[PDB]
């Protein structure tokens, strides 16, 4: 398997969710960015794996589950069975990552993408080693009930550019946003 990555879109007040959905109106090109970044594998013959908590799984409309072109893994401590459509169910993040080191999965999985929610991001971001954060800065406050922790810049470096990421400010529906990539190596 390849690198470990988080991807997230965050409002100005660090919100990521509200009532089991996103806090802002649908941003078509921001979803297309999430889709492109999580689907595109750098190695031929492999797919990427997305890891998410249970509420994040059910925040994806059923018609889009599992996320196409990606191996979908759901984290849950209490589910008796994998949610219909999921490819894998793991009881902890460590269990999920050790799944990716199985030989027959490692030769089919390139990047691992953490796609939320709050507790999954937090655990991944404190795991030592190489990690990238793909962060969309939604440049407006939105009412939220689920949040992302402020990034420690002594640990995470904001990259000046990244292949395949547009650096210019974007705007949809009167909402400005910009794509950022952070990297730590501790
Ligand atoms: N803006 C963004 O980029 C973004 C990204 C993701 C999500 N969201 C939004 O955020 C909200 C969902 O996130 P959330 O933080 O509320 O919930 P979440 O982390 O997706 O789901 C929490 C549940 O997942 C399971 N879980 C989480 N961490 C686990 C671990 N380490 N091991 C085993 N199981 C684990 C537990 O399920 P059990 O109770 O079954 O044990 C837990 O109750 C929604 O509003 C969604 O739309 C936004
Ligand atoms: N930067 C960024 N932005 C976010 N919004 C985000 N959201 C999440 C979690 N949630 C909602 O909380 C999603 C809900 C739905 C989809 C979804 O349906 N995806 C399809 C459709 C693509 C299309 O519309 O064509 C696909 O990826 O194929 C994806 C994530 C995680 N990480 C994100 N990171």
Distances (CA, A) of 151 to 36, 69, 73, 87, 155: 24, 30, 25, 31, 8
Whether the CA torsion 91, 4, 38, 26 is positive or negative: it is positive
Q: Please state which CATH class domain 1-186 belongs to.
A: alpha beta
Q: Which technique was used to obtain these atomic coordinates?
A: X-ray
Q: What 3 state SS string does 3-36 have?
A: CEEEEEEEECCCEEEECCECCCCCCHHHHHHHHH
Distance from residue 35's CA to the centre of ligand 2 (Å): 7
Decide: 14 in ligand 1 pocket, CB within 6 A. Answer: no
Is 22 a known active-site residue? yes
Q: Check residue 74 and report its DSSP letter.
A: E
Burial (CB < 10 A; 0-12, 13-18, 19+), residue 137, is middle
Q: Is 182 labelled as part of a ligand binding site? A: no
* Residue 87 near ligand 1, beta carbon < 6 Å: no
| Domain locations in the chain as residue ranges | 1-186
Tell me how long the chain is: 186
Q: How far is CA 162 from the centre of its chain?
A: 17
Atom of ligand 2 nearest to the CA of 61: 18
H or E stretch covering 107 = none
Does 44 qualify as catalytic in the annotation?
no
| Active-site hit among 4, 27, 30, 89 | 30
């Amino acid at each position: 398997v390849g690198s470990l990555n988080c991807i997230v879109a965050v409002s100005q007040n660090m919100g990521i969710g509200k009532n089991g959905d996103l806090p802002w109106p649908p941003l078509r090109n921001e979803f297309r960015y999430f889709q492109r970044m999580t689907t595109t594998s750098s190695v031929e013959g492999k797919q990427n794996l997305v890891i998410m908590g249970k509420k994040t799984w059910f925040s994806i409309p059923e018609k889009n589950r599992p996320l196409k072109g990606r191996i979908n893994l759901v984290l849950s401590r209490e589910l008796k069975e994998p949610p219909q459509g999921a490819h894998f169910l793991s009881r902890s993040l460590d269990d999920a990552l050790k799944l990716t080191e199985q030989p027959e999965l490692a030769n089919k999985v390139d990047m691992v993408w953490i796609v939320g929610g709050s507790s999954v991001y937090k655990e991944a971001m404190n795991h030592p080693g190489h990690l990238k954060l793909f962060v969309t800065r939604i440049m407006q406050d939105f009412e939220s009930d689920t949040f992302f922790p402020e990034i420690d810049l002594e640990k995470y470096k904001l990259l000046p550019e990244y292949p395949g990421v547009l650096s210019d400010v974007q705007e949809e529906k009167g909402i400005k946003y910009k794509f950022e990539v952070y990297e730590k190596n501790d």
